[PDB]
């Protein structure tokens, strides 16, 4: 398919369309350049003054991100960390034997020049450091990751958890609309702080201050949705990762899977830098995102939905993908899973049961179902259509541009 | 929808193209464990 | 299933998913390190002053959890408890013969030194202490375990229960929503006190102050829902635990059952520490919870619902499980139970009935092997008769909440 010619006059035309750059960036190819993650904390002066700084800035509509970053650094000096075994990731050695390592053992540096208010601010608040203030500051990050009235349903988490052994209350000024604390996401150093805290307390779950997770946990596997959908598909089908891999039936989904399964990324390791590749600034374009794996996302979530998944109902429907082919593949997969039940005796009293035209195959093997589909001249049967119908009908209040709306519109008619 | 074009002819052509693409799914096995799908194999009127 | 290869270019791919540790911790594997449960009661200064402290702090304000813990320890220092037989659990011996042990015959230690108002508060309150005040403090935990408008329907019962020869009134005035007294939920020592009260009065059911249980009772078998559903399934099917065990038909449900049935956990023991593994801080991840037994929970509750269970109607539907396979397995189980009635003559007057007297027909009894063979002969797909049975079972169920297994079952089998 190299040369194409207009047949009316025998001339050569060269079909071409605009380019698409934004290549994916792997976490490994970041420690292949540098060996450290720089966390720039500009100002290093007076912890108590920073305390008063942040309180006074919070009671009004103005507060510097640099000041809150410095205060978080100062107040979160938990160097409490008895290592159980060893801790190493991407070649970086972060802990051996029984060392007492800390939160900011991920490299720290000093930035620029500018600060705002005068030295001693308001000496009103005290001993509010290691109890709640960092918890509040960190939860505001997860509160900013939204745009619909989910925020005022999500701020209850803050006031309700910052009252636990602390008992504080209201404090913000403007509700939302991208204005108050939702700017903090755009500070590289703040996101680095949140990611470091989340990683640290993912290692040390049994720590006094594990509650700080209630705001930074949204950083873990940030922009790694496709991996989560792959795991969810494995959980819903009950199949192994290898079988689910074998059920991929589209070229582009196979490409995206190959890209996601690159071997040297530590994606299955317990405590790695990979889950925070975005907030740590390890990558600017996640290879595990659903925007870079649109076909796979659509296929997997659609199959899951046909298999009675409740989360898949609200998954976004990507653009610029093979809807028809992906949908036929997902339909075949879900029909295979939903018609061939596992069903095998597990316990006994010395009394076991041995279990050995144009009818659906016996098990859940890709080859047999593909042969059966060939025998059906490659088009879904009326029974498969009725299965999809039963699966999608009786679906309530689904929003627009979701795969739930797509599936109901496609199979319920 | 632009004006001054062959609506009927363009729509019949697009219908043929879309029906061909949407009725003949790609669908081919991509991964295996040493166990692939062999595709060997309505001769009169029937869609290709 | 070790090597997977892309066939178009003959390359090797390694499918893998993020790890999930959060392992379960068994109560037995806790007393193997420590031999005591530390209950830190910080300020053991002046029992009478604490009464007024907590009384005024509760009447609108921020009453310290340390104050209420100290007051509860002081007021529930009744060493009343004549032991009937022996009391031993997980190797720890808490009673012999006719001992007169008490509620706090569990380890107690001294924490910190920080206090709020200093000294004698308001000598306004009178005795009336161990009569209602501890009951209120303990019932606030039961009120704190919820979040929906059930709280104002469950706090009414509380104020009505403190009138046992007492007849007083209320105290706070602000709505719940986890803000006021719900902080007590995250306090290790408060939960330890509530669990000790519940266990003590579970042994001494006939004791005068056993009423304190109605509020602390939500601590028993906390985060042990799967065990309760196993028992409920046994009661609803009427089968033995062994037969119900034999009716598990999915690998993952069998795994979860094996996990829950670990032999050295005293889960069937009468008066054990096991039911309070969470509030006593014995475990950080309950092995008997529904979060750690999703497949089993869903399967059992669905089967129970098909057998007309009223509890299963509102049971939560877990995520990340084999919905299709679990539902077909539960359908087979429920259809077997609902088609094979027990039915056998029990009494007579010398005149008994002996029971020894088409092709695609359901097996005779409730044996797993015959029904599995029948399902094999039924092309591994549920028959129209069982489907109609499930429809009859789920239809006419009104007012089911979202994300419950009841709504799932009605949407699945009633079209």
Swiss-Prot record, chain C:
Which SUPFAM superfamilies does the record associate with it? Answer: Rhabdovirus nucleoprotein-like
Please name the Pfam families in this protein's record.
Rhabdo_ncap
Q: Where is this region: Interaction with the phosphoprotein?
A: 349-383
Ribonucleoprotein as a keyword of this entry, yes or no, is yes
Which key words tag this protein in UniProt?
A: Capsid protein, Helical capsid protein, Host cytoplasm, Ribonucleoprotein, RNA-binding, Viral nucleoprotein, Viral RNA replication, Virion
Q: Which GO terms describe its biological process?
A: RNA replication; viral transcription
- Superkingdom of this protein's organism: Viruses
- Give binding positions for RNA: 142, 151, 205, 213, 285, 316, 401
A GO molecular function annotation here is:
RNA binding
Q: Does the keyword RNA-binding apply?
A: yes
Q: Where in the cell is it found?
A: Virion; Host cytoplasm
Protein family (similarity comment): Belongs to the vesiculovirus nucleocapsid protein family.
Q: What does this protein do?
A: Encapsidates the genome in a ratio of one N per nine ribonucleotides, protecting it from nucleases. The encapsidated genomic RNA is termed the NC and serves as template for transcription and replication. The nucleocapsid is bullet-shaped with the tip containing 8 turns of a conical spiral before reaching the helical cylindrical trunk. Nucleocapsid assembly is concomitant with replication, therefore viral replication depends on the intracellular concentration of free N, termed N(0). All replicative products are resistant to nucleases.
Q: Indicate what this protein is called per its UniProt record.
A: Nucleoprotein
Q: Which gene encodes it?
A: N
